[PDB]
Amino acid sequence: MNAAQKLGFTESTKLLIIHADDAGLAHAENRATIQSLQKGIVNSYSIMVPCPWFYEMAIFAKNNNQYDNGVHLTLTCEWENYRFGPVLPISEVPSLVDENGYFFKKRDKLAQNAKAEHVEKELTAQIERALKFGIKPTHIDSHMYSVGAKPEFLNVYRRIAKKYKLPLVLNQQLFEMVGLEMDLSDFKDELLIDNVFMGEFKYFEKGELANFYATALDKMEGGLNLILIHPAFDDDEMKGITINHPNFGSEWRQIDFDFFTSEEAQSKLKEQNIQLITWDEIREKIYKDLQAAALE
Amino acid sequence: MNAAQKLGFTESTKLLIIHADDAGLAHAENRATIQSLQKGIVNSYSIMVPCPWFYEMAIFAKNNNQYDNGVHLTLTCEWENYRFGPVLPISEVPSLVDENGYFFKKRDKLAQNAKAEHVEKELTAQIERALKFGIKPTHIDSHMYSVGAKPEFLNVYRRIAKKYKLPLVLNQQLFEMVGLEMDLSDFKDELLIDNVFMGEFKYFEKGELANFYATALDKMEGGLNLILIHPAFDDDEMKGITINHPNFGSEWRQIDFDFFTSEEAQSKLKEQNIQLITWDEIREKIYKD
Numbered sequence A: 001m002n003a004a005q006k007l008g009f010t011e012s013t014k015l016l017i018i019h020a021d022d023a024g025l026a027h028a029e030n031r032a033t034i035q036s037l038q039k040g041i042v043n044s045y046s047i048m049v050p051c052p053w054f055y056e057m058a059i060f061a062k063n064n065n066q067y068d069n070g071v072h073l074t075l076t077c078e079w080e081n082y083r084f085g086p087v088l089p090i091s092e093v094p095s096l097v098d099e100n101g102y103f104f105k106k107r108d109k110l111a112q113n114a115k116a117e118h119v120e121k122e123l124t125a126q127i128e129r130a131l132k133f134g135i136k137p138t139h140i141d142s143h144m145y146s147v148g149a150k151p152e153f154l155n156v157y158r159r160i161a162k163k164y165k166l167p168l169v170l171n172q173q174l175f176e177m178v179g180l181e182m183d184l185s186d187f188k189d190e191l192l193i194d195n196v197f198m199g200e201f202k203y204f205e206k207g208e209l210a211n212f213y214a215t216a217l218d219k220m221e222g223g224l225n226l227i228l229i230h231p232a233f234d235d236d237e238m239k240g241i242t243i244n245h246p247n248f249g250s251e252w253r254q255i256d257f258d259f260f261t262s263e264e265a266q267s268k269l270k271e272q273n274i275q276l277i278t279w280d281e282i283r284e285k286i287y288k289d290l291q292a293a294a295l296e
Numbered sequence B: 001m002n003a004a005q006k007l008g009f010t011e012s013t014k015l016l017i018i019h020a021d022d023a024g025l026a027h028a029e030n031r032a033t034i035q036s037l038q039k040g041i042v043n044s045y046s047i048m049v050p051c052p053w054f055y056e057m058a059i060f061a062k063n064n065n066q067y068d069n070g071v072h073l074t075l076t077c078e079w080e081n082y083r084f085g086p087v088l089p090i091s092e093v094p095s096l097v098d099e100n101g102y103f104f105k106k107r108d109k110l111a112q113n114a115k116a117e118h119v120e121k122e123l124t125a126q127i128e129r130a131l132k133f134g135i136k137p138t139h140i141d142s143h144m145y146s147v148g149a150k151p152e153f154l155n156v157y158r159r160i161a162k163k164y165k166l167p168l169v170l171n172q173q174l175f176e177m178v179g180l181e182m183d184l185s186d187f188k189d190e191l192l193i194d195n196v197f198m199g200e201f202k203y204f205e206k207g208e209l210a211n212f213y214a215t216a217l218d219k220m221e222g223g224l225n226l227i228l229i230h231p232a233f234d235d236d237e238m239k240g241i242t243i244n245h246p247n248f249g250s251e252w253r254q255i256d257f258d259f260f261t262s263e264e265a266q267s268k269l270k271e272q273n274i275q276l277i278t279w280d281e282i283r284e285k286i287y288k289d
């Protein structure tokens, strides 16, 4: 059984979430995310609480409930010159940060250094800060999927998701990405994404990233599908953030914004009978199914 | 005696520091500040440690000490959507922040709320963090001159400068601007700048801020003169930061950059016989072996 049936649809249904990550990271990213939601076919996004432009994104989110919004849990900071650290004070979560008090650049260093207790504390703090700013999140997911850097970290993530009664991103391709060879019979109580799509260097370098997105739309199969993008204007701010980091860098994010606000993308959606769904709808369906099961 | 005399110069000598504030505020401001030092006549600057682009500026400062660099002490955050707070944990300095954990927008809210012990801890922590990053500051000054919001805050500021054996920005006009009516007789142990120049909105709104800087250089007289500017490229980042805040806004900051990298401004230094000086030279005259 694939996730589309577990949500009430036929097997053949091409469920899709087009999800913008890293909202709150930069002003250019906030503006491109908002525009892709307003006009594009992007239909969900998640927010990086520890980030310098989180506040602006929060003001947008608390007053624009119609757009499916979640918390982009952040434990790593990958950029050369633009560095951020935890919501909580360094002294409370010392194993999460480098000598400058910023998150590590790599999941490897994080998994080698971080204590599961510090991870639970800081992730809970990020969600609590979002809630106190008036955000009503519909899901939680993970920047660079650092929650998979250790099995204990993923268990903390699952436990936090159940505590807040929120859906979360769990998927087998993302598991293999982070080397987390966890079994599949542990996830009986969870909804697993059948297919996660994201851009790759090998297509970007050959000028074919837009082509990859087009083909991905063209050949989407039945089940729950998730497209992860990072729309942002390729301006001075993003060039400064992504210096020496072409992978998911500023030109890449520009390509994301262009393709997923393009009439080509909408035409491919309608051509293929791909049905968009939000995390909010998924949470409502799971809530009603559990309410119905518990009484009966 | 003006400050040039106390520094060993004749009375008529025109000492000038051309000083970029708000470094570390933004990437556009970091880049305009660096370029105005390397290719313009700017010769000093100071860094906002709490700000989100502090690290980029710190890397530059630690590797390029030939440019006079100080700590722009920060206790207020004036911008609408770009918010920041203290280096220290909120529980340590709770009186310094609004309900979101950020600095208040105006000096007078700071004066209403802040305890001086919290101000002392937070300013000390900004200097200490700069030092940990390998910055070798030559002076300290104050964002929005909020050290002047209360006399006891200014006393903290003076004590901190003496503790680090660094000079600081003190000046009678700055005192008046922030409503501080201190009598000068308590500053015998201090070096006061004779004249502080900064842009004014009434010239900016005529399009004549550049002309204002030209007159400032033309009319400069003997003593210690400080020009305060905020060079930054007027790009999308700065428009996003300075939204609804045209006073020292993004267009204004671009004008700062363009004037102080121009042939006009350099020629004016020569024509007026203006002698540039840094805070480090002053520091070496005051604090001896």
Ligand SMILES: [Mn+2]
Binding pocket: A021, A022, A072, A142, A143, A144
């Ligand atoms: Mn991310």
Ligand SMILES: [Mn+2]
Binding pocket: B021, B022, B072, B142, B143, B144
């Ligand atoms: Mn300032």
